[PDB]
Design a binder for this molecule. Structure first.
Ligand SMILES: [Mg+2]
Ligand SMILES: [Mg+2]
Ligand SMILES: [Mg+2]
Ligand SMILES: [Mg+2]
Ligand SMILES: [Mg+2]
Length: 1185
RNA sequence: GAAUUUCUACUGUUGUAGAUUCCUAAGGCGUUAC
DNA sequence: GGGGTAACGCCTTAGGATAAATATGCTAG
DNA sequence: CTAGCATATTTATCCTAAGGCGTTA
């Protein structure tokens, strides 16, 4: 248990943000409201967003004005051209290093073009907002007084923009990051530009095409060196306009490839370049008024001729029989499908008649057909299934008038239900009449002379009903848009650098202190006018009650704070560095990155740094205990030691009366850092974040720091989102929800208000902390994990997690020998208290979501439940692994995803893997002792830090990822796998395929058949041994999938019985006991071969699935060389019981193979954890172990 | 019709059990119903 | 499996999680 | 003319250690 993971603690540091609630104390809120800080901070946030937009426009203008004067050398361009398109060749140094060199050359050229502009000097400084942005706005043609006023509001709040300016600094960088202009222009636009150039050259040179060759500026006439003008946003925009879309160069090719219908012509479609970085109802009354207006417009009062669209349209449709059918047009869209379904009951009669009798080429597909042509086609449609003579007569007109009047005879008609019903009826009528409506004009010709008396009225009548679609769009935009809003406003309390640091020296500039009284922590944000109130404390006497202010001391960055302080202009005369030390620092001989490294020079510099630290008045109080200077391989170790030992927290008693006077006078804004575990009523185990916060200041933790209090915290303000409430009244019993609780009625002495935290305005507080403050260097622990697994072989179990069809998640824990130790479905979780059948309520929420989205009142959710269900599975996995000494093997959803039809989709399982990785990065137990492996101060770290879904490979510490190929269709016994593919419809090939069978004989004993073959004949890849697949398994058949009497269904069929009933029809004798291999070569009767192959597909695949009950098993058709065939129903408690545990068991077996591979290999740090199909299949069929 | 830094399941009784890394910025992709 | 559209969702990446030196506004003069 | 204080704004700049391919559910 604890010994296997005892060494994997304190490996790498993590940074996590703790969130609390700030309860105002005393007169804090009164003074805040009196000074109007909340409204001013809301206005400040609005102004901040507007100034962000203005600065973004300034940056766009700077980019446009700077990249129009860049001139690429050109010599490197052709070098990149030849390197990129010199075929695949081999992944050698010339393929990678030279490519990186030329890419870096181009990026440096672009960055040099960037830095040459004068604006770049003061682009991320106060000079921008103070004098460059106002000048730019003045020179702006449109600008406005509002823009200048918003900019001038931030005249002194320049330090508020430091984060935004550091975000903007990434764009003008030559690094390999994806947030850089140069990186984009080199890695995304230019490669696609080269591809487009080559493909256009090939297309032009190969041969002329049907479309015009664009011969009749233009990128075609000027293509070489055009990329130099593509760099600017305007240049690439004009390029994309020329090529994309308006007639473009590739528009003709797109029009012509559809004529070709060729894959080799579809690909030449030229891809567009990526855009440049930084480039570009009211209420229910109105809805009711609009509904009433539409109702008045539709029905009105039958004044000034019949304007009622409801009845005039019906009369016009009924009169279609009298009107000539040679000029009435009909849509070729799904309206034809609906007409066919309504008239005959089959939605394919009319289309089949049109495609088989009207004409037979590309059938001259036209948008609109003719009523006369449809009638002629339907008058003779080969009569697939109908009466000998059909009284269709004017079938189209008869159906039209029928659906117009005799459908229901109820066409004429604040609550949504009535409005929704009326709208749905109107849309049904409009969709019914849509096929008779003409869309646009000049649609593939046709549109000859029409019936004036009918179409002239129809076009005028349909325009009134055409207003529903914009009305529907407005309705769906307004009425469908959850009860609460998690919108918060950042509070600064008039301080730009608020909470930026906790240090004692910076507490007057950051105006934030941390107090603590009787186990409750408080946050004091002094008024900016009175920021020096925590420096003149009269006394720290203990006789009266006192708070406990925090004395926070830090040396954040050693490599920066040491040279900055020791070599500054105002301190270099104090520490007095010798000329040798100055020369050493200037030359860079101390830096290992530099080429002039000298160990003695670095050691001399470190000795000088130690002497200066002992000279410093503030830093000599850190109690720095340094290892001997001769043991530093480089200054990096000294910096690590300085950073580790440079952190101290002490608490100073300050009189409570003084703090209360400060709060009352308005000089201090006292908030209580709150969390429901700080309540005087809380009695159970607290949250993990509560434990971390309490351990931040624990004396045991402060003895050797593990958790560190970070700076740059934030205070937010969230308003109320739910005015009305849903309160459970006091002294009124409430029905319990869980169906396993022994108690059904719960009565409380107090009110319980649903979403109480969203009905009142709440302050917030986001505290960053650093766990494992002294974890030296181990971010990739795979080297230690494999080295440990190489030695302790008969101690480590394996855990396999699979996402099944009947179970949300399944887990199987197998020993190192192979036999299962513990298997359990994870669709239900069993804690120390009531168990949640997460499978059930997930399906209930799935049903409720569609029910709500269908009628009205959509709340969705579901995703949070599925992402809150895995939060318990993750804890279960962690506890099981810690208490069973097991590695975790899971599916690899990058290189091998499984199919669909799973309760946990691919994207949800990816988040489950991410959350498991995140939980295993710092795994504490809420019950273990602090100084115990796995406790609060000795957390397990069994997984590398998360970087990306693709950054993690086939191992993430103690986690392993294996391909999910052939994991659910193999035997726990000797591993027969269905590698067959009958592939019928080729009569000639069936005889050859069946010829390769070694022996097809009837076994009178044991009642089943016997198929003998070898996997060398089929599946040309030579692997495995001779198999003896029998006909004892796979007794579930699906008849068909569509309609009725051939819908998805399950019928229990005895495969031997079907064998006998198929063989007796052709006198293939089998009772003699001899083989029938030389009996099927009789040819003829392709239906017999089809049925035989369909039955063969029903006798060699193990999984038998049903669409109804939980009936599911993996009964196998092969022998276990012992006299029995594996069946999931007869579970041995050591083989997967259900049909879903097979996948988990085989993933655990893949993990066992990974363990064995690690054991055999003696080349750690380069182990090959990728298991291919061949070696996996060999491993499963262990035969003689 | 159920309390929460926040989420999920709760009533475990002004709360129970387990996840919980927050802010800012850039870009790419995808049902859809227009 | 469908002709030149964005409200909405998903994904990727990047920066930070700082104290102290230094320049500037304001009072004093 | 102007020493001193308070406040806002730019500044200082390590080193490791990487990471890949078996097709198919
Ligand atoms: Mg400040
Ligand atoms: Mg709790
Ligand atoms: Mg699976
Ligand atoms: Mg809580
Ligand atoms: Mg809830």
């Amino acid at each position: 248990g604890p010994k296997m993971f005892s060494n994997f603690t304190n490996q790498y540091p993590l940074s996590k943000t703790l969130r609390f609630e700030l309860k105002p104390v005393g007169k804090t809120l009164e003074h805040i409201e009196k000074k109007g800080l909340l409204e001013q901070d809301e206005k400040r946030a609005e102004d901040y967003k507007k100034v962000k937009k203005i600065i973004d426009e300034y940056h766009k203008d700077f980019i446009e004005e700077a990249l129009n004067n860049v001139k690429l050398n050109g010599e490197g361009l052709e070098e990149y051209y030849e390197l990129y398109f010199k075929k695949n060749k081999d992944d050698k140094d010339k393929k990678k290093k030279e490519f990186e060199k030329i890419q870096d050359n181009l990026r440096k050229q672009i960055v040099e073009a960037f830095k040459n502009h004068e604006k770049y000097k003061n682009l991320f400084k106060k000079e921008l907002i103070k004098e460059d942005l106002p000048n730019w706005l003045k020179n702006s043609e449109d600008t406005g007084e509002e823009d200048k006023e918003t900019v001038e509001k931030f005249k002194n709040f320049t330090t508020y923009f430091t984060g935004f300016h550091e975000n903007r600094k990434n764009m003008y960088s030559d690094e390999e990051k994806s947030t850089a202009i140069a990186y984009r222009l080199i890695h995304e636009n230019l490669p696609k530009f080269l591809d487009n150039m080559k493909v256009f050259e090939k297309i032009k040179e190969k041969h002329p095409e049907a479309e015009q060759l664009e011969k009749t500026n233009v990128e075609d006439i000027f293509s070489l060196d055009y990329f130099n003008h593509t760099l600017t946003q305007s240049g690439i925009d004009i390029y994309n306009t020329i090529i994309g879309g308006i007639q473009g160069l590739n528009e003709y090719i797109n029009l012509y490839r559809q004529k070709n219908n060729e894959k080799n012509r579809k690909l030449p479609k030229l891809k567009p370049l990526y855009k440049q970085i930084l480039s570009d109802f009211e209420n229910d009354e109105e809805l009711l008024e609009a509904i009433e207006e539409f109702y008045e417009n539709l029905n009105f009062s039958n004044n000034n001729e019949a304007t009622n669209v409801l009845e005039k349209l019906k009369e016009l449709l009924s009169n279609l029989a009298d009107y000539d059918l040679n000029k009435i047009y009909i849509r070729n869209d799904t309206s034809l499908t609906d007409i066919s379904q309504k008239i005959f009951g089959d939605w394919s009669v009319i289309k089949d008649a049109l495609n088989a009798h009207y004409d037979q080429k590309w059938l001259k597909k036209q948008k609109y057909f003719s009523i006369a042509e449809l009638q002629e086609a339907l008058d003779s449609y080969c009569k697939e299934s109908d009466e000998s003579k059909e009284q269709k007569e004017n079938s189209i007109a008869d159906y039209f008038k029928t659906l117009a009047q005799t459908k229901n005879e109820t066409d004429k008609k604040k609550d949504v239900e009535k409005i929704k019903a009326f709208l749905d009826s109107i849309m049904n009528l409009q969709h019914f009449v849509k096929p008779l409506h003409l869309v646009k004009g000049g649609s593939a010709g046709a549109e000859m002379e029409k019936d004036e008396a009918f179409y002239s009225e129809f076009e005028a009548l349909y325009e009134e009903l055409s207003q529903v679609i914009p009305l529907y769009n407005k309705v769906r935009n307004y009425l469908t848009q959850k009860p609460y809003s998690t919108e918060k406003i950042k509070l600064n309390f008039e301080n730009s650098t608020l909470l930026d640091g906790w240090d004692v020296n910076k507490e007057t500039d950051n105006t934030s202190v941390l107090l603590r009284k009787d186990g409750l922590y408080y946050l004091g944000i002094m008024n900016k006018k009175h920021n020096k109130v925590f420096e003149n404390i009269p006394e720290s006497n203990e006789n009266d009650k006192c708070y406990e202010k925090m004395d926070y001391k830090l040396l954040p960055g050693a490599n920066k704070m040491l040279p900055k302080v020791f070599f500054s202009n105002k301190n270099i005369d104090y520490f007095n560095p010798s000329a040798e030390i100055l020369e050493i620092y200037e030359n860079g001989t101390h830096k290992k990155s530099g080429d002039n490294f000298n160990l003695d020079d670095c050691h001399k510099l470190i000795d000088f740094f130690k002497e200066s630290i002992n000279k410093h008045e503030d830093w000599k109080k850190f109690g720095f205990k340094f290892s001997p200077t001769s043991s530093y391989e480089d200054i990096s170790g000294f910096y690590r030691e300085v950073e580790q030992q440079g952190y101290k927290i002490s608490f100073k008693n300050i009189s409570e009366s003084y703090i209360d006077e400060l709060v009352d006078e308005g000089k201090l804004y006292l908030f209580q850092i709150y969390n429901k575990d700080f309540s005087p009523y809380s009695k159970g185990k607290p949250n993990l974040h509560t434990l971390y916060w309490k351990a931040l200041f624990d004396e045991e933790n402060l003895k050797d720091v593990v958790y560190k209090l970070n700076g740059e915290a934030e205070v937010f303000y969230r308003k109320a989102s739910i005015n009305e409430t849903i309160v459970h009244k006091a002294n009124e019993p409430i029905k319990n929800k869980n169906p396993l609780n022994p108690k059904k009625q719960s009565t409380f002495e107090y009110d319980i208000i649903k979403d109480r935290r969203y009905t009142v305005d709440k302050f917030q507080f986001h505290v960053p902390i650093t766990m494992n403050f002294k974890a030296e260097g181990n971010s990739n622990i795979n080297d230690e994990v494999n080295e440990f697994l190489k030695g302790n072989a008969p101690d480590v179990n394996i855990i396999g997690i699979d996402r099944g069809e009947r179970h949300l998640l399944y887990l199987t824990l197998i020993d190192q020998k192979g036999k299962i130790v513990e298997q359990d479905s994870l669709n239900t979780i069993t804690n120390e208290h009531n168990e949640t059948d997460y499978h059930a309520l997930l399906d209930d929420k799935e049903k409720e979501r569609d029910k709500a989205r269908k009628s009205w009142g959509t709340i969705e959710n579901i995703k949070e439940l599925k992402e809150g269900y895995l939060s318990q599975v993750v804890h279960k996995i962690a506890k099981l692994m810690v208490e069973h000494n097991a590695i975790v093997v899971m599916e690899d959803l990058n290189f091998g995803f499984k199919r669909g039809r799973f309760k946990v989709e691919k994207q949800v399982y990816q988040k489950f893997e991410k959350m498991l990785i995140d939980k295993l990065n710092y795994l504490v137990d809420k019950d273990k002792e602090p100084n115990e492996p796995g406790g609060l101060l000795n957390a397990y770290q069994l997984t590398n830090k998360f970087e990306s879904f693709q950054k993690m490979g086939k191992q993430s510490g103690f986690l392993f990822y294996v391909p999910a190929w052939n994991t659910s269709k193999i035997d726990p016994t000797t591993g027969f796998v269905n590698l067959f593919h009958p592939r019928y419809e080729n009569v000639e090939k069936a005889k050859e395929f069946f010829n390769k069978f070694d022996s097809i004989r009837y076994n009178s004993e044991k009642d089943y058949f016997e198929f003998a073959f070898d996997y060398n004949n089929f599946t040309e890849k030579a692997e495995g041994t001779k198999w003896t697949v029998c006909t004892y398994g796979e007794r579930i058949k699906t008849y068909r999938n569509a309609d009725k009497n051939n819908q998805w269904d399950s019928k229990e069929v005895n495969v031997t019985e079907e064998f006998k009933n198929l063989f007796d029809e052709y006198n293939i004798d089998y009772k003699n006991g001899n083989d029938l291999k030389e009996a099927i070569l009789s040819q003829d009767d392709a239906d017999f071969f089809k049925s035989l192959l369909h039955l063969l597909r029903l006798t060699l695949q193990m999984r038998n699935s049903i669409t109804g009950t939980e009936i599911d098993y993996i009964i196998s058709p092969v022998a276990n060389e012992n006299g029995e065939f594996f069946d999931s129903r007869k579970a041995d408690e050591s083989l997967p019981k259900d049909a879903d545990a097979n996948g988990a068991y085989h993933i655990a077996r893949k993990g066992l193979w990974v363990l064995e591979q690690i054991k055999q290999t003696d080349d750690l740090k380069k182990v090959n954890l990728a298991i291919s199909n061949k070696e996996w299949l060999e491993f499963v069929q262990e035969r003689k172990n």
